[PDB]
């Protein structure tokens, strides 16, 4: 004719937010982004 009562407790979280390895950024630089319409980029030649 009796009872059992017990509560609980929690811990939410911690974070660091660590990212961006160096090998991904070196590949991130050597690319293209697009050029409007007529914004050619050119070639050039010389030094015969």
């Amino acid at each position: 004719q009796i009872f059992v009562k017990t509560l609980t407790g929690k811990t939410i979280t911690l974070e660091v937010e660590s990212s961006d390895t160096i090998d991904n950024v070196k590949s991130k630089i050597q690319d293209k982004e697009g050029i409007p319409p007529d914004q050619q980029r050119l070639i050039f030649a010389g030094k015969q």
């Binding site: 050597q30 914004q39 980029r41």
Partner: protein, 468 residues
């Protein structure tokens, strides 16, 4: 305080991105729930969808205005857009009043995480003519050594990047330097004394020194191949010695901003380099430096290393306290967290990229400086194009001793020709200011006849005819 005319126009426009109705929308036609709401211009998810790698700083100014100004009272107008400082406050607001005896955590510079900048000041550098920079590479084709220059230009809006400013250049000035096959190094005192008088004539012509260029070619065999490929993914993007020259040039030219507490922030300066592509050509590329970490530590702690990708970190001598620099890299087995307890940290991380390009030849708004681009430049003493008044009989001559005004005014709009005339200061400064304004602006026909009727232009063609 007053900012630039281009900077105030980007602030007034919101730059919102409209969206259309979708299947996922459950609301009515006269509304928007979340899927057809107006998109903010600072969301990086829309940026990398169209392969834009940065968030267009005027929109980054808007994403911090939402954090500064809120719906609550506030009553502050803080606008926290300032340069983050790594120097040590001496007063320190505590009991450790000298730094020789005492330092706590509220004045100690924190460990640099090396996070990349997500916003760039200049979003897209553009040029005026392919014949302008063709003379710059032609300087290398005659003496075989590297060159140097400074780019004068202006700014305007850019509609491709959402809330972005594009960089326009008009002419390139070369300072007197000592060339060398490996690299180059000139005196900063004679350049600064020479650049002071060029800034005088740039004010009336509407020009500003906002860029610089330096060449790096290393020709392979002068036959089928154009140049070697020095800068690639495995090699360095920018050498650490040229990071120092790029950092001092941005600190000398600040950008005025009302949102900053000091009055100046987010310098708009471009550094372009001629290096060549991977396969076969001499295609150029440009990157500018980062403001968040690199722009302030260059006053005290940047030291040169033997590696072009990295730069050495020196030691503290009683005032120059530096924090530890960390970055992530892969080990021999896996990918690990920050390892750097070692000097010679890389400097390619602290560079943000730009998109260079040349406009179409069929149409433009204006070009404003295409006269010949074949006149001998002012400080090209290594090349043979450094002539005296013998060139003025060959270049313009008031063509065939009786020139038509449609063929005479087209030659007078050159940048280096007008900068060579006023150095002799034959004309009055009032008549010279209307001379350069006639050559650079439209409806010039009524004012060109005013120049030929003046006695100063008559004395210029008379003193040229008797001389060789």
């Amino acid at each position: 305080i007053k900012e630039l005319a281009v900077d105030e126009e980007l602030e007034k426009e919101d730059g919102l991105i409209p969206r259309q109705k979708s299947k996922l929308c459950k609301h009515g036609d006269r509304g928007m729930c979340e899927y057809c709401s107006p998109l903010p211009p600072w969301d990086k998810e829309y940026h990398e969808k169209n392969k834009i790698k940065h968030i267009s700083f005027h929109s980054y100014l808007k994403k911090l205005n939402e954090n500064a100004n809120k719906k609550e009272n506030g009553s502050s107008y803080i606008s926290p857009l300032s340069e983050p400082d790594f120097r040590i406050n001496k007063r320190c607001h505590n009991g450790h009043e000298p730094w020789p005896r005492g330092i706590c955590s509220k004045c100690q510079p924190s460990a640099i995480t090396l996070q990349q900048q997500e916003f760039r000041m200049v979003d897209h550098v553009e040029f005026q003519k392919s014949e302008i920079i063709n003379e710059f590479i032609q300087a290398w084709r005659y003496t075989g050594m590297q060159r140097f220059g400074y780019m004068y230009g202006s700014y305007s809006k850019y509609d491709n990047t959402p809330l972005g400013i594009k960089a326009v250049v008009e002419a390139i000035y070369e300072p007197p330097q000592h060339d060398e096959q490996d690299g180059l190094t000139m005196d900063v005192e004679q350049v600064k004394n020479e650049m002071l008088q060029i800034d005088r004539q740039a004010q009336e012509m509407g020009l500003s020194r906002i860029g610089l260029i330096f060449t790096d070619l290393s020709d392979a065999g002068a036959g089928d191949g154009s140049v070697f490929c020095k800068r690639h993914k495995d090699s360095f993007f920018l050498s650490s010695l040229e990071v120092i020259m790029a950092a001092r040039h941005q600190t000398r030219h600040p950008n005025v901003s009302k949102y900053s507490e000091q009055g100046f922030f987010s310098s708009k300066f471009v550094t372009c380099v001629i290096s060549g592509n991977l396969e076969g050509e001499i295609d150029i590329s440009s990157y500018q430096v980062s403001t968040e970490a690199e722009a302030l530590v260059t006053a005290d702690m940047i030291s040169g290393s033997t590696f072009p990708s990295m730069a050495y970190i020196n030691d503290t001598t009683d005032e120059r306290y530096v924090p530890e620099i960390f970055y992530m890299k892969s080990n021999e087995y896996g990918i690990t967290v920050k390892e750097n307890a070692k000097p010679a940290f890389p400097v390619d991380y602290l560079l943000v990229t730009l998109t260079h390009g040349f406009p179409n030849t069929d149409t433009e708004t204006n070009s404003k400086f295409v006269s010949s681009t074949g006149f001998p430049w002012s400080n090209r003493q290594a090349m043979g194009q450094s002539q005296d008044y013998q060139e003025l009989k060959k270049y313009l001559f008031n063509v065939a001793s009786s020139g038509d005004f449609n063929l005479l005014h087209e030659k007078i709009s050159n940048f280096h020709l007008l900068l060579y005339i006023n150095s002799l200061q034959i004309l009055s400064p009032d008549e010279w200011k209307l001379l350069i304004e006639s050559a650079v602006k439209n409806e010039w026909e009524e004012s060109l006849l005013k120049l030929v009727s003046s006695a100063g232009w008559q004395t210029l063609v008379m003193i040229l005819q008797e001389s060789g």
